[PDB]
Symmetry: C3
Subunit: 422 residues, 3 copies
Amino acid sequence: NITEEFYQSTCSAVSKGYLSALRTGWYTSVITIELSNIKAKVKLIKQELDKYKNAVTELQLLMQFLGFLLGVGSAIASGVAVCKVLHLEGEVNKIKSALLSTNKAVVSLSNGVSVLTFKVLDLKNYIDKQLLIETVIEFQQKNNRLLEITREFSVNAGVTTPVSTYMLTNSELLSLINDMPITNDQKKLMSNNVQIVRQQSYSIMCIIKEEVLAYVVQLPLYGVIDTPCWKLHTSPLCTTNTKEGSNICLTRTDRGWYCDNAGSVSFFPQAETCKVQSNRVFCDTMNSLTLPSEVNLCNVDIFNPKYDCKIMTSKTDVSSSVITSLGAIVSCYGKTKCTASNKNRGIIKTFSNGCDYVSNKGVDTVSVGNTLYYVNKQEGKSLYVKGEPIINFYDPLVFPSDEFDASISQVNEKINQSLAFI
Amino acid sequence: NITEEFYQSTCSAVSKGYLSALRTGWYTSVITIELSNIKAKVKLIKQELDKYKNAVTELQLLMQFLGFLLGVGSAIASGVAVCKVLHLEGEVNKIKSALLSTNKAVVSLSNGVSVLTFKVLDLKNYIDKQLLIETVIEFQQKNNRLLEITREFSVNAGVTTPVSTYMLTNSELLSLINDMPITNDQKKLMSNNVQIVRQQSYSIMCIIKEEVLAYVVQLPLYGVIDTPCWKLHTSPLCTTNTKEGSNICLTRTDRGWYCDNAGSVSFFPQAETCKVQSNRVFCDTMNSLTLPSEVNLCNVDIFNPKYDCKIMTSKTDVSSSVITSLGAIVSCYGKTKCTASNKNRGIIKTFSNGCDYVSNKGVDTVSVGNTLYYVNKQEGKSLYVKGEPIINFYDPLVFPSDEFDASISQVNEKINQSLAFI
Amino acid sequence: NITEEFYQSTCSAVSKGYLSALRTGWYTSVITIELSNIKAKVKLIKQELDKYKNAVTELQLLMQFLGFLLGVGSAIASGVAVCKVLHLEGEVNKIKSALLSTNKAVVSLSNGVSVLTFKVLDLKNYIDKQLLIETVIEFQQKNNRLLEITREFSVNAGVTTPVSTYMLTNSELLSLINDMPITNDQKKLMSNNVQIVRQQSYSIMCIIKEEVLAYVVQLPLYGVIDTPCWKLHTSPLCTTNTKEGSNICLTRTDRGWYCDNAGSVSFFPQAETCKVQSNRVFCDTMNSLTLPSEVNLCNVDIFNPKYDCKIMTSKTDVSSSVITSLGAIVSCYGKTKCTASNKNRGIIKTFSNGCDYVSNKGVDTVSVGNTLYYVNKQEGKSLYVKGEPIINFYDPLVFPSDEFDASISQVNEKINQSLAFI
Ligand SMILES: O=C(c1cccnc1)N1CCN2C(=O)c3ccncc3[C@@]12c1ccc(Cl)cc1
């Protein structure tokens, strides 16, 4: 299921076996709260009603390495577009109308957007009936929900994420998912991962008008599902000569998540925009580059003539470890002490100067200098691919050593150039 | 009102029409909570009083591209300076004294700071009266506020932001703003944008002593208001030759917010330190550089002899889009599919290799590779300024291609140098 | 106690006098909540019981400059390893068993991990007794705690930090610390800084099975305590020639926290991974490099032959200030206005072009351009170390000016090279 290959020649490892779930688009729903325009166990409701009035008062005052290659989006542009529609005249009344005999209804907005509208709290109907037994309790439980939505919007300037359980309860989110217009695969994936959906959603406050509070919930559309994904971990590969500062180093800069998508590979350079759940990888295509699938060739052979593998160079031989999915890459240089230990037995391997790797089978921790790393202890097979470390192929006298946005061919050109002068 | 110019020659766009609101300084107020030193409907207050004692117990245990050019400040240095004063002897008693007959009072501290002090909760007076009818309810509502302030300080190590509605209610914040010593313009701007004020404020726990809990609220001073602001969006400008990796690229690195300020331009390289509300731009001068106004000349003519426009160079021709205020810049290179669509009609434009631009009029989404971008759908006019793309002016054989902290003149010097050798 | 030296020659300052508290490892405890499997003042408990059932329902659906040199760890790898054990059969029942006659017990898990288990809420025993007077109140207070833990896990995908006061109360955290297996020094340091401990902890949801909710709390182990620490502040050092863009600049890139640790120095390049409490510095060794102690020699003499001091170079002479522990470094260049003021007296010093420094004694604010900086007003002595600014030692005609990952020797080599050609 989950497997891993370490490449000794380029000091990198590839974890495969994952399945994708990529946010490719947004769904926008309009959540509504109908409000009231009002001015022994009684005095309980007295303050509960002052709380209500203030919440409305408060709401109305309110409504007055390679990541640099990414483009720049506007995350809530679609949601805010729907908000601007809800300010047109009659547009709020059109909604209030549709949600008259039911909580859930689909409405066609004037600019031609079909949206799932949803009345999750009907305070108006509640207040203008009872407040004009358990009815004290239920008012507090619904009022408290109103106060919390109010709290959230007024410390986040009307835009919140993840969408809290007060903005949209589980039972509400689940049925919203079900009433959505998506495939059965998408419905199940969202239903079985609602905490992730919550984290990739936005809650946007739109309007208070005509006794209605309206906010858009902006939900993720996963248009790519169950394609193969793999994570690339890289570490500095340096020479290990004796005289200090006479060493040269080289790191693959294309680390991150890689997912097959529509004939290409989606690449996510900041592997923190992606959230892994078991063997499923939730990513957002806004944080990706679209590369040719040939990019995968860089792991097998970094000198392949089909794709120009990206690297940076330096003279900075510092030690560090990279904790992978199924093991640990260790770059030990200079006088650093680098080890790996079993939980009960102690040190089992001492690393030499160079870049090496150890799997999580039998290993619980790795130490580099004064830094303790615990390794992920998930089941999976690791393969160690022996190979000559490519930094040995370069003459230090003509090596370009501050290249960052570089590649194999750019380094080869700089070398060929400075070598020709000689 | 909001307008936009795209510059085809340098692959950048400028959105203008915004008005500034820059945090230039801090106001520090001392919020107080008077506490009590104490050891049928009755048993309600019993646990409500145990909650109180613990909160106090708990509080006392508690009280035992170009962003790298920015300097480094200490955000709460002014607030903490006031805290250190409140530990001097008599200094707390001086406050307790002033707030004896009113909730709001201005006190002169011994080190010569005139501060707006504010007793927002008087538990002492409440407890040592009633707890020695609705009085169970009001105790819970004030106690709950105490527990929440306690919660916040003890997960944020005594420093919180944005300042929550428990630290300072709307009604309290509003009158605090009104009793403040600032201009009527500043008062209105803060009153009409209290959620933004909250986000730019700090809450700093100072002391528990002599039955008083004291925290400083650190509020923003907007010393620059209603000056013109404009946002600069830039994208990679590359050549589009057929043989891959034979292309050269160039990006303007001075993207961010620009605001006229006191004869100069304040420049905010990380356009996320700035929050836009309609056409108003809230920035913080701590995250800015002060540039000559001549920096604006880089948009009209990037080769102007008055200011040295900053760029970076590469060989990395990857596709990406930049979503602007009123449209979209698209950098399409290689085999990438780049389009723009109308919401109901589908693809309306297919982009060629190069850097191009489309406005948000008639356009709802832009696609680059596997990445869908929604465009901002705000009203405004866009102007497309036709011009020869400057990367065509360079000979690829003598082009410096890993420059990051570069500029037009630095690139010209490197070229002139390597050309002279030839 | 806290002291500071500014080095005029390299435009940097060192704040010393701090004591370390480094997170070197993790302790993992298993917090449990025993649940119930169930289907006048009465109707209070009715909804309180529906809340309970849902929380369980909801939980079960749920359970279906130099920072780039750092390695990459997996912060909760140890905690999650314990979670995977708690899914083995009998493993939950082994715990439920041990916590039968007490809230606190140490259990040996099957894979040989001795963990402090802790039953912080016994709803089962409570529900299956009473709910089959004040007992309405206590149920609400314990139920509310259950709902909040539920809230937190379901917006954070089961992993929370800082560990909230609902996950683990103060009284619980304190005794957990006391029952822990650590030194008396560690116990006192944690007890006296529980808000910091909270911030460096993780709460990981593990399992619902056999009427038990289990989450791991992952607590910090401070294996290095009371070693000397010092912070290095650096600023751009530029020449100040008249013709613009004819100037060369140089910045020490090794700014951050430095702490003596086990014969070496732990270096924290991102001085925000470290939290200072008075004169104590809480760091995490995962965000550090292990350097030779000789790295300290770079402050006294940057040209020392024992360690190769790291720098970057540019032509970008922009003004900025760096607020230190006890003063302010100012880099004033070009036409920028740079001053320092006393709180009541006004401007007291106007800075010249160059890099200069002023202490916090008599000084309250510093101004660079349109940017106001407040200085830290803590007691301590500053020493100004006069010295020739090293950028004057370089010939601008052969100066390498886009070096970022550079050093004194690398710059000297580039110079020696381009000078030999001449
Ligand atoms: O980060 C900096 C930098 C510079 C000055 C002051 N503070 C930081 N630099 C300059 C050169 N650089 C590296 O060698 C490097 C390595 C890993 N991440 C970022 C960088 C980078 C860089 C960043 C973006 C691009 Cl397009 C190109 C290079």
